[PDB]
Point group: C6
Amino acid sequence: VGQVTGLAWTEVGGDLLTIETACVPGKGKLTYTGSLGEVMQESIQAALTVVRARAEKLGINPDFYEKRDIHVHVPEGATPKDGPAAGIAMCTALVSCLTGNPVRADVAMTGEITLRGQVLPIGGLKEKLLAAHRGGIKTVLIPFENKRDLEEIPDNVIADLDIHPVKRIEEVLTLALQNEP
Amino acid sequence: YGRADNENRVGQVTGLAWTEVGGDLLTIETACVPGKGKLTYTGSLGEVMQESIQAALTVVRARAEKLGINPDFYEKRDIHVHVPEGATPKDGPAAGIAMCTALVSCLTGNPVRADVAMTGEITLRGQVLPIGGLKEKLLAAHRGGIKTVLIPFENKRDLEEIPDNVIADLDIHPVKRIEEVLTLALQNEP
Amino acid sequence: VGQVTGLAWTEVGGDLLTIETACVPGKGKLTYTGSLGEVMQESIQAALTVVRARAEKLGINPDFYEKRDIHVHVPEGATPKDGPAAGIAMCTALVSCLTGNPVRADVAMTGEITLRGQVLPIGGLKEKLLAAHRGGIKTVLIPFENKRDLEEIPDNVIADLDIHPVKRIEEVLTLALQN
Amino acid sequence: VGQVTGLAWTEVGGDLLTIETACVPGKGKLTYTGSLGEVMQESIQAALTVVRARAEKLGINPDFYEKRDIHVHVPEGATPKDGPAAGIAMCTALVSCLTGNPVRADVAMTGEITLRGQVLPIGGLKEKLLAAHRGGIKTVLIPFENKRDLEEIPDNVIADLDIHPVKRIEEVLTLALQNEPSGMQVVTAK
Amino acid sequence: VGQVTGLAWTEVGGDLLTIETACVPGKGKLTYTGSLGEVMQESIQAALTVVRARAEKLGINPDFYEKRDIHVHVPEGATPKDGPAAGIAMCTALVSCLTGNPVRADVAMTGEITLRGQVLPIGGLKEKLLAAHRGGIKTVLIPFENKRDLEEIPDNVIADLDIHPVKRIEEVLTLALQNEP
Amino acid sequence: VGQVTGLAWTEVGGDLLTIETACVPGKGKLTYTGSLGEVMQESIQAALTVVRARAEKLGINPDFYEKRDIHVHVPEGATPKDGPAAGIAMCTALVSCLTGNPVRADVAMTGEITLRGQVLPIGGLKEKLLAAHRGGIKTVLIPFENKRDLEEIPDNVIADLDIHPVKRIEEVLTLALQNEP
């Protein structure tokens, strides 16, 4: 619940990230921490807007923005992270936490989100899937246009991962959340 | 999962503007969701491009009653303007009319025409100013399969330089003012 | 939306500008854009303060700003601008804007404004007036102390132009507002 | 009302300042413009605090103050100015706009202000007094601890200037303002 | 109450840090001072959200932050500090403060906190435990994954210490709080 | 009232400081001027929190802040000052102006304050004391652990001064304030 394995860029160490999101009694503030670069901070804003746009249909109270504060933290806190690859992870974690819909266990996702809910292709796919296997992720959700980059990946890697090329965020919410979103 | 709700709250217009790697097609997304009058803008946007967004929103706010929008709309709403792709640096004023069009579309629920792209600097007075790098821009729209391009009236001189087959392919409309831009690009009449 | 042709310093192109001012329903915010240097940003503040101090006399309710937002823009948006010389153009635009009393479109103006409504001299009167000339401007308002500078300006530019030297903002508004 | 001549530091031209203050309707905001360095800005914030702390005595209603905005401007706006030396001038001008008590025109002043209302010595008095001499200023207030430095100033410059060494801000206000700023005027007879 | 010895990175290396927290009347603000670097400041934010998400459980009024301000200060004022290692100490200090549950005097602690309450390993454990030894610290709490780092710290130093490898914040608070929460 | 002589570092050196505070009708803003470095700024924020924490005990209306503004100013405005050694001086000036308890003019004071009200040791004690001596200060309050530092100072200087080594801010307030706090 509000905890998603995303695959995004890091300055050092694995391109696998745990995204945590908390919704606590507040005034409507948005905090985001974890040594996050601007492009990544912007992806959180984009993902939160997607959620705000769909709130009624997502079973969220559309006026949650006023009586709750949301903190998005990505450990390890001192490791620099950046890029837009965690966007769909950001959205899923927010939907989970605002709803209480637990995220599925062995699932990771990579992909850039747009405000309309399309999933955009990302970079360094090969290194991302490598952090997926070496973190023991069974299912990896990827952007449809990144299918081109699947042919460059070792057979050992792919064989163990269940990779789902996805086009839209509604596919992501279905494949990642435990319950009906 | 609100895909429909997502559609009616996020405007979407294809713009021709400057990016780190040259003038290019951009999708300008503008969301208007429940809020308190805030404005967010994201997309690795330079400062000139951030100022064009504020200019475009001011055009809508000033003309809200005339576009069938509540003048007190901004009191109960937040607005997020996002320009993909998120890690690509973009700057400049050439997406101004696309930004204006996106806000009008979203706030009036008047969908934007498919095969239309636009380039132009907007002013608070509603006039469209000429932009630079038209060739590159039109070349992008052509390769992307756009049929109709709105350009600023004073960029007519710049069409001589465009390859003939690209000009022949494109339905190019020199516009002087925003009213023309909105009429040509939206599905309904504002 | 107020609209006044100013003559002010720019990094590229002519020293001619359009000052735009909007005043929409809001919360009392001021926004200013136009690739503005800080000196020019401060001149927008000084200009708005002049109008706000003279709200009642100008036919404006002094509590107008309570429930409205103001945006000052200076196209062309990508052109770096700076200096205090668009001060009276900004004051005029705001006055025009808050009153809905249009500005004469055949007028341009240059000058630094003070909180007391005084118009102070500016630099590069020549570059500015050449620009007003190349731009088809018929009438040009300049500061009073700038009269001694018109000697260094081309006789043909002086001949084409209707130059009115001014001391205060009330002269500017009389000459610039159509009503 | 809201116009005091100060003597402080400027990058170019004279060390003389024409300080302007407007008190227009507002929500209690303070603006300070005129290309002012940080020390000078901080000197403006100390001057306003002084006014606020003595509001009842200066007969300023805190309720009136909170429904007003204040703008301190020091033209010419493009000239860099800095230092604490305009503090008593700022405090004078601020009392002025807030009370509509105009400042005597032949009067300039130099000195650092303290929250306690005391007037601290400044530097470059020779420069400052040379400035006011060039402006036909006849009355120049200076901090009492600066009297020592009057000696090294040309007796020609001294003569033409009516110099009042001052110890507190309360003296400053009574000297440079038109009416009596603090308190009720009572008449006694022997 | 409102005070915890943490071991965290400072200019002169890992050292004995006194984390202080205050809670006073206000309107929901958060102040942090002590020449703190940004990662260390971000750790304070994560520590607070932990407490805010768990208020009722800790016996804190869920809406405590409504009419109250929080100041977290790390003396000595002039000494630059940074890193995520003081995070379980911030959280403990906040819990102590908001509950009036005194922190034990014999306990120093080091560890990165995540919003979910896990304690992540830190670096420079040697310097930190060598500082707790010189300051008369009996009991030291360290992250569970830091256990193998003990092997690089002089045995005469470790033998003198009551070392507790912890995994979750609930362990940290039980061991560190004078009373039983 | 609201004036305290403190001893701290200035660009010329550890010198004599006249610390002013003002409390006027406002909305809860703190302003601090005097060409202060950020360590000095943080000392003010800590000192104010100390006063806010102990508000009711001091006679102060605990809601005082949401209704008033505070300006702390340290002339001379153009002279750069920094560090934490004016902390207890900040705290006293703040207690002074908020309570209307005039400070004794003849007392200087130096020492880093903590959120707990404890007085921490400072540096350049000699320079600080040479100031107070030539400043005509009769009584000087110094941190308790700074007693050792008295021996690197001329005996003629120290013999002229009534030095009070303090441990806590409550000691500071009784010695420096005119009346019962």
